[PDB]
Amino acid sequence: MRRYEVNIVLNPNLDQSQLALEKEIIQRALENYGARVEKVEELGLRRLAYPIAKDPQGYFLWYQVEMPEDRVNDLARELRIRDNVRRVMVVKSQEPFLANA
Amino acid sequence: KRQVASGRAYIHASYNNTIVTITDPDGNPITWSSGGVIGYKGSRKGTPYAAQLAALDAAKKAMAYGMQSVDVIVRGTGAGREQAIRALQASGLQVKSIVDDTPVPHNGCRPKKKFR
Amino acid sequence: KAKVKATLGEFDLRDYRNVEVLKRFLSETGKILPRRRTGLSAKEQRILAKTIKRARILGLLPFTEKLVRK
Amino acid sequence: PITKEEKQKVIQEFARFPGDTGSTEVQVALLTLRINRLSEHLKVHKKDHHSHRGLLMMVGQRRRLLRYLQREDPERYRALIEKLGIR
RNA sequence: GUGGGAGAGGGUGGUGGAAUUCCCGGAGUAGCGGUGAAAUGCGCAGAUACCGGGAGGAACGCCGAUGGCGAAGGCAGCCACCUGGUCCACCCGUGACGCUGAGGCGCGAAAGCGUGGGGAGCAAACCGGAUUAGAUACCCGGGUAGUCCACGCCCUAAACGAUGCGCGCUAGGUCUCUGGGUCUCCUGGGGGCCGAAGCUAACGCGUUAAGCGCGCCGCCUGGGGAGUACGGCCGCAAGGC
């Protein structure tokens, strides 16, 4: 497999049953596409710089994964099809460049 | 006739003209002035004088509309783009924030051959 | 008129997710600072660049802002 | 990619004796693997000339090591060839 | 071979903000635009300036460089995937397997052709506007091909470093990109500048030779006629050798 990072950014006006269902469906997508969880950090609510979807802020999840090769893109197409996910980004992991150290 | 008393003041300057727009804090206009609003005709429109004259004029108008507190937004970099702000500061309105908004592309559009 | 990495923690350059540090390299308008005023090196700066643009895509950092005074 | 044990299969397979990573055998199998993979990519991605060029240089390599083997040890070269199906 | 690195090298998929245009909506009048000054043009069917919403196409500011990658043309948003080349360290493996390359074969900016798509801005031709000896040219306002994408042709150029490739020799200094090191410094590989010896008609070049040598290819032989004419090959053509 390979070492990836996923960022998800959603609409902050979600109640609890909603945000639950979203998260669940993301999990079921990672499973379904081959990707596995190394860890999770969800910082959640924060105030952006430019409005994304007319919204002044957003709800961020960060999921660090390991997975197959070809599948990555199609996986993120499945993530993006969501209506409450206003943004998704993926990256291959990088080693923590420490500068000025 | 609205009785507004606080709002946005836009300056706009090309090297060909100047236009001021007084407006309300969610963006709708109140009055406006320009180079030719005052009778100035030709190239004479892109002077700093008429810049002044217009600022003062639109300021005057809105000041009779009831305007007091006015926060400025300058789009365009031009001839007496300054003299317009420099005027409507001394208008009697109170200039609160002067902001420079001159909008610039991230390189999208092939410009008229004059322009490169 | 001090540089940036002159007063600053010794920190991960290649992290987009963290704003608190990344912002300190942008002007009042969103403009990424030039070398002279950033202080860092060419591989550094080249990396600072990519990190910033990545975060700009996450809406955490700005693409451009407005200039006050004037 | 071409991963590491993905290579080791081949190197350990065409070796003349334990430890030989360098002879014409190894060299030509390795090369020829790289070659076939590229042909696979360039099957789609027809539009990519800058990879294609490199693949020319690559088959030219293969061919040159082969003329070497042939002129130097004929049997081992017929061996290698009928091992890889080619020429 | 192994270990590590830099990169706008290429390709496929996706996606992000600024800006131009246009359509919808609001608020708001008498002008806007444009020039040396003008006019055509657009504006009461409500423009310009302003705020919100949508559609679409192209191009990626800052970073950015006197910088990097590529054989050459050439290559800049970001993410992923497929992939070429190349540098260094280790001194491990093969054992001269090398250089050059007539002929072939392929890539080759822009423009141009063919068949489809697409079309925001620009814009040959073109339609108009002032200059004013006179526009039919510079200046202004419209505008079609084209510019973009897929497929197939075309093969040119100041395709330039006007400098063919490869290797070995021959002071240094300085600025920089990128590896390694015992990291005031040293040691490989790129990119600049000044300069030893040396070369050069001069300008200039000078370890990135235009120096000293060897190998191989291309090419030259006063100017015009003329890159024309005839012929041959290629091309749908324009045209090219």
Ligand SMILES: [Mg+2]
């Ligand atoms: Mg004017």
Ligand SMILES: [Mg+2]
């Ligand atoms: Mg005041």
Ligand SMILES: [Mg+2]
């Ligand atoms: Mg690239």
Ligand SMILES: [Mg+2]
């Ligand atoms: Mg409207």
Ligand SMILES: [Mg+2]
């Ligand atoms: Mg009129």
Ligand SMILES: [Mg+2]
């Ligand atoms: Mg009319």
Ligand SMILES: [Mg+2]
């Ligand atoms: Mg709009």
Ligand SMILES: [Mg+2]
């Ligand atoms: Mg349309």
Ligand SMILES: [Mg+2]
């Ligand atoms: Mg620049």
Ligand SMILES: [Mg+2]
């Ligand atoms: Mg060039």
Ligand SMILES: [Mg+2]
């Ligand atoms: Mg690579």
Ligand SMILES: [Mg+2]
């Ligand atoms: Mg040895």
Ligand SMILES: [Mg+2]
């Ligand atoms: Mg031996």
Ligand SMILES: [Mg+2]
């Ligand atoms: Mg030839």
Ligand SMILES: [Mg+2]
């Ligand atoms: Mg061509």
Ligand SMILES: [Mg+2]
């Ligand atoms: Mg073309």
